[PDB]
Amino acid sequence: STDNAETGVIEAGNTDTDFSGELAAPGSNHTNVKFLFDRSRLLNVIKVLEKDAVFPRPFPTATGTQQDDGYFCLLTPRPTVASRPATRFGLYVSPSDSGVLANTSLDFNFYSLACFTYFRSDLEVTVVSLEPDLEFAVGWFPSGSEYQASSFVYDQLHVPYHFTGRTPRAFASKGGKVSFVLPWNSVSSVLPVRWGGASKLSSATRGLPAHADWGTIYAFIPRPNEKKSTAVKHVAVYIRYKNARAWCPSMLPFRSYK
Amino acid sequence: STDNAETGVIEAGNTDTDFSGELAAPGSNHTNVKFLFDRSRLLNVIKVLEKDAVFPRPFPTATGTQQDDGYFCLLTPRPTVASRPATRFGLYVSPSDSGVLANTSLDFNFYSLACFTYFRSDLEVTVVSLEPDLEFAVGWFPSGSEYQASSFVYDQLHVPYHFTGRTPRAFASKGGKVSFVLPWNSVSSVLPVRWGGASKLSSATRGLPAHADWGTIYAFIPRPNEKKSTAVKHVAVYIRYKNARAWCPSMLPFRSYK
Amino acid sequence: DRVTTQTAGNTAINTQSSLGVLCAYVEDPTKSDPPSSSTDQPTTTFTAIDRWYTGRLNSWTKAVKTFSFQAVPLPGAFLSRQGGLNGGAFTATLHRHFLMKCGWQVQVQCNLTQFHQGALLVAMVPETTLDVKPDGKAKSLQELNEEQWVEMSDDYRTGKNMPFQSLGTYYRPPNWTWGPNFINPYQVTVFPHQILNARTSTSVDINVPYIGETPTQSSETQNSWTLLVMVLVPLDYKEGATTDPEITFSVRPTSPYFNGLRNRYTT
Amino acid sequence: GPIPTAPRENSLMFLSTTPDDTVPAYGNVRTPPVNYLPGEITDLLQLARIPTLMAFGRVDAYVPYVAVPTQFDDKPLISFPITLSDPVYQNTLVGAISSNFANYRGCIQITLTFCGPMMARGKFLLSYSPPNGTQPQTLSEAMQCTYSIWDIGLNSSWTFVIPYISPSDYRETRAITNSVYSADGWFSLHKLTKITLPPDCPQSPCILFFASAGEDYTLRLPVDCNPSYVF
Amino acid sequence: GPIPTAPRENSLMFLSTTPDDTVPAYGNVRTPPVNYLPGEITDLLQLARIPTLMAFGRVDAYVPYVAVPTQFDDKPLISFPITLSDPVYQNTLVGAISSNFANYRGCIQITLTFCGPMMARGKFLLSYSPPNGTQPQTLSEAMQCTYSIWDIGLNSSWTFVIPYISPSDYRETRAITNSVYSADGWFSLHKLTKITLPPDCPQSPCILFFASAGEDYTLRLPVDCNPSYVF
Amino acid sequence: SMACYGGFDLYFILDKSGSVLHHWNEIYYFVEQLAHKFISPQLRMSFIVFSTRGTTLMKLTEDREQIRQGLEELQKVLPGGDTYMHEGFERASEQIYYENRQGYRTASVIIALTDGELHEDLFFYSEREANRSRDLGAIVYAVGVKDFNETQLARIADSKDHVFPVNDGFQALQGIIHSILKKSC
C-alpha cells in the first residue's frame, strides 16, 4: 500500500491489506530470545593443565616470557586472544613455527544471530573431554579475579594452589563430564556484544570492553606436579546461555557474495 | 445368509445368523493401530562416521565422486537407497565388486501390516551399537534440512561441524545406548505408505514422496579427525512408532505360492 | 426401487439396475472444508463443472484373462484425454490452478445380457502408479490402444516395475525386487468397490472423498485416486451373442477447491 | 537430600516392547492437522471384516473362483482346510493380518458369489466339517456336518459363517507344526443339484469365493512377520 | 530407605539442547539491575519486521537500488526468486535471521521507494508469480499473476506484500537442494509507463528496494548457522 | 591363434525383460535352433538369463539330455523385469574364469539378445562387463531382436560387424559359430 519509508517506521502489513486474503495462523515461538540462546554450543578447545600454571601476562607480551598459553578459556562470545578479551578475531592461515600461536576463540553460533547490542544471561558450562578416559577437573575464577599461580608442598609433592579455593573446582569422574551453571558475575550491568567506548586500562583501545565475560575456566588433572604426563591432553568447553535477555537491535554479519 | 456381494458392503455376520449359536466374547485389542506399531524394530545398520563426512550427492551420481556412503540412515519405513528415499527396494543377489554397493533399507515388520495408505506417528529411535565397548554419538537433522559437512580446527585438531548444532546430538556413554523420541517434523500432514503422485523435484518420478521421513540420523565417534581409527564400526538403529494413526485402508504384500 | 437418476448440473445419467451409491469412508463425501494450506480464496464449485464426464474405455473380450486390469487415473484422465474423456470446463480450470482438492464420484457402465457371464471389479484404488510404464514415462493414448488391458503379471503383484530414479554410474545398480505401489490382486476389494456382475447390475456407483498426504495437492501431478476395472471372472458366451461389450465410465468431481491461479500450464 | 534407591537386575536393559515412554529430544512441535483425512483405521479388525478374494489352484497363476463342471461326481467341488496358514488364505486380509499374529478367536465368514448367467438355476451344499480322522468327500458324509443349502436366484451371494468350534479359547493361527489331518476341519462346496442352463448359455459357470471375518473375530499376540514378501 | 530406581538407556548422556536446568555452582548472586535499558528484544521477530536493504548485481560491489533505464524493453526491470537463500536476501534481516532457521511461514513484505526527483511521474507494475515452469518475462505474462500498479506521486513508497501461497504449512527457508525453476516463484518489477521527466532532470532514477517481514511471518526449527561470515 | 583350441564353448545370454514379453516365442526358437544344430561333443553350451537377477539356467554342460532338459525349461520362462545385461555377463564371466583354470586353451563365445535397450546407468556396466569378458578371452556376439540401436550394441559386441538382427541371426550364426569348429582341434 501507499506508504513513506523515509518516515523510518513501516507498519508490517499482510496479504489482506492490498489484496483479498487472510491472516496465516502463528506457527511457533522459536524466535524467542530466551528460547533461542538456551541451547549448548562449543566455545573453545583448551589444553589441560598438568602443573602450577603461569597465567598469560598482559599485552604487549615480549619474547622469553615462560608462560602457559592455551590453557585458560575466557568464557565470552566476543573474540578473545591468548585467554584475554580482544576486538578482532584472528585465525592463522599458514601457521609457520615462528612465535607462539595464540589460541583465539569466538562463538560462531552467537554472532550469526546476535542482532542486538547488549546481552545478559546466566551461563551453563559443560566441559566435555576430548580424550579417552580422562579424569580432569574444571577450575574457575570470576570476572575480575586472577589465577593463583604457585604450589604448596604437601608430603613432598608439589600440589598447586589451583586445587583449592573459594570458587568452584568441580572434579570429574573418570570418563565423565562437568556441568554447572554460572551466574552473571560481571560488574557491568550487561555484556556488550558491540562496544564503542574506550577501556581506560593498560593502554586504551577503542571497542574493547574490560569486563564483558562470565569468568575464565581452566582444566587441570588432579595429581601433583611430580606425576606429570608427557602428551598433551585437550578438553572441550560447551556453553549455554540460561535466561537470556537482549536489548537494542543491531546488525548481523556481512555474508559475502563470492 | 442371502446377501449381495456386488453391493460392495457385506455385513459381518455371526454363527447365530444362519444357525443356532452364540456370540463369542471379545478376546483382546491387540489389533489396535496405536498398540500394534508402538513397539521397536530394526531399521538399518549404518556405519559410524570417523571424520567430517560428505553427504551423498543426489541422483544420478557419476563415478569419481568422493563421497561417504552408508553412514546416514533416512528414518523411513518406505524403501530407501544411498540414504535417500526411493521407490523400489533392491537387494544385491551376487554383489560383485564393480561399483559402490548402495545401502538400501526397508521396514520389513511394517509393510507386512501396512494395510493402509497414510500413516502418522512420532518416532522413538534407539541406536544400539554392534561393537564391543563403542562410545559413539547420534546426530540428527530434520526432514528438510541438510548435513553440515566441514571441519573447524580447534587446537590443531580438525573437529568437524557435526559435533555442534541446534538439532539433538545425543552422546552415548561407553557400552551404552542412545534413545530419544522424535516428533512428526515433516511438512506433509501424513506419511504416504503408498504414494501415487509425482514429486516435482530433480527430474520428476512418479510414486516417490519427497518429504515422507522423520529425518536422518548418523553415528559419529566423538574424537577429532587426527584420532581416526582403521577398522569399520557399525551401529544398529531401532525404531518405534509412538502414537500411531493410520488412514485409508489398502493392500498387504503379495505372498507367493512357490 | 432400482431406478436412480443422478442429476448433476446440466448432465443427468440414468440406471435401471442400480445397486446403490457406495459412499466411501464417510456418510456424505460431498461435505469438504477449504484447504488449510492456502492464504487466498479458493475457486469453489460452479455450475459448469458440477456435471458428469462420460468417456469410453476399452472393450472386454474373451481374450482377457483373470485379473487383467485397466487403470483410469483421476484427475489424470482429464488432462491426457484418456478414452475420449475431454474434461470440458473442468480441465480448462485445472490447467490454470496450481493446487486442486476434490473428491470424486464415478460410475462404470457395462451392459451384459442375461446370457453372458463375467464380473468386473470396479474400485477406486488410492495412490497408485498403474498408468505409468515400468520405465517412468506415463502411457500415451497409443500404448493404451496397443495392449487394451494390462495383464496382472508378477511385476505388478510384487511392485517390481514401479518407476525409479537412475542411480548413475557410481552406484552398482541393485537388483530391485519390491516396491510399495504393488497390486495384491486378491485384496482389491478392501478399496471402495462394487462388482459389476453380468447378472445383478450394469452400473456400479462409487463416491469417494478427497484423500491425500497434504490438505490440497498439486493439480498436474496428483494421482490420489485411480479407477481400476479388474476382471475377476472372464467373459464367456455362446456363438451368436453380442461379442465385445463396451465399457464406459462417468466421473464427476464433488466439491472441488482450486487454489493458486496462474496462466495455462506450459511444460 | 539423596533419595536412596536400589536399581534392579534389569538396569540399563533395552527391551524393545517396554510399555512406556522415553525422553523427548526436539519437542514443542505443532504438527499440521489431519482433520481433513477421512477413513481412519482405529483398529485393524476393520479390515479383516472387509471380504477379500481367495486363491484356488486351477484344474503362480491361481484363480479366485471355482469352475463348475457339468460332470457328476460325489466329491466336493472345492475343499480346503480351515487353517489360516493354508495357501487359499495367504492373500486374504483375514489370513494375512492373522498370520502376523499368534492366536485368533471367532468366526471366519466365507462369502460366495455365483458369477454365472442370470438364467442359471442350481443349488449348492456348503459343509463345514469339524476335524475328523478322514476328510468327508461323499455328499452323505457332508450332509451330516454343519451344512447349508444355497439356492441360486435373484440375490447372488451367500455368507456361510464358519462356527468357532474348538476346545481352546484361542486357536493357533499358524499350523506349521508336525502335521495331521488338520484342525480346524474342512470347508467343502458340494453341488447338490446340477446347474440347469437354457440353450445358448455358457457351460461351466464360476463361483467367486470371498473370505471375511465375523463380527466376533478377535486376534491376540503379535509376532514377528515373515519378511519373505520382499525376495 | 533407598528408593529403588531404574536408570534409563540415556543415562549420563550429555544432550546439548535438553529442555531442563542443571546444578548451580556459585549462586546467591544479585546482579545489577537493567531497568534503565530501553528497547528489549523480547522476540527476534521484532527485527524481521524492520525493513532492511536488498542487494542487486549492477548492470563485491553490489547496489541496493535498481537503476531505471530510458530504453523500452518488455522484460522485468529486476526479477528475483522468492527464496530466502537467494543472494538478494543474504544481508536483509529477514533472510539472515531465517537462514539460521529451518522453516518459515508467512508473508515477505517488499517495500519500494522511488528515490528519483520530485518532478518525475511514472508507474510500475509489481508482479509476484507463483512457481510456473517458465519465469514470466512479458508484461502480459505478468499482468495475469498477482500484481499491483504503483503510481509515483507525493507519497514515495509501496509495500507489496508477497502472499504465502504454498501447499505445505511451513516452507523450507533454504532451497540449497537439487534445483529447478525455484519455488516459491518470482517477484518482478515491470515499468508500465516510462518515467516522464521534465527538462534538466537526471536521467535514470533509482528505485531503492527493501525487504521486511509481514505481520504473520513466523519461523521454526533452529539449525546450526553457517560460520562463513568470519573467514 | 594358429594353435587349435582344446575346448570350445557357447553362452546364450538371453533377455527376459518386460520388453521381450511379446517376443519370447521368437527368442526361444532362435536358441533351440542353434542347440539342435550343433550336436558336437566338443561344444559345451550354457543358458544364462537376465531380467533383474542374472541367473545361470544351465551350467556349462554338453550332455544332450541335460541340454534338452535345459531347453524344456527355457520354453516355460516368463519374461518381465528390468534389463540388467551386465548381470547376464557376470554369470558368463564366472564361467570363463573358472574354465581358464583347467590348462585347456578353450574358446568362449557369447551370444546376447535384447529388445529394450539399456538406460545410461545400466549401459555403463554392461559395456564394462563386456570389456571384462573380452579380457577373459571371449568373442561377444550381440543378436538383436526387434528395433534396436546398433550403437548401443556396438560397444557391447566386438564391433558393428558382430551385431546381427534376429531374422538374419541364424543365417549369420550358421557358419560364424561353425568357422571356429573347423579351426578347433
Added chain:
Amino acid sequence: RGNNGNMTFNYYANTYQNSVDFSTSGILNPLGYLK
C-alpha cells in the same frame, strides 16, 4: 492410549512428549456406506 502402562505420572508436558496438532480455526464404524 496405546502401548503405554504409565497410567500414573507423566514427567514431561504433553507438548514436549507428544506432538499436538495446531488449530485450523468399541464402536467400529464401517469404511463404506451403501446409500
Added chain:
Amino acid sequence: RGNNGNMTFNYYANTYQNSVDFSTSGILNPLGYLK
C-alpha cells in the same frame, strides 16, 4: 520461561538457580515510535 520443560518442580531455590537483580529503590511493541 525459556527452553525449560520442568513445569513441575524446582529443587534449588530461585536465588541459587537463577540470578535475580537487586532493587534500586504476545504483543510485540515496536522499537521505533513516530511522534
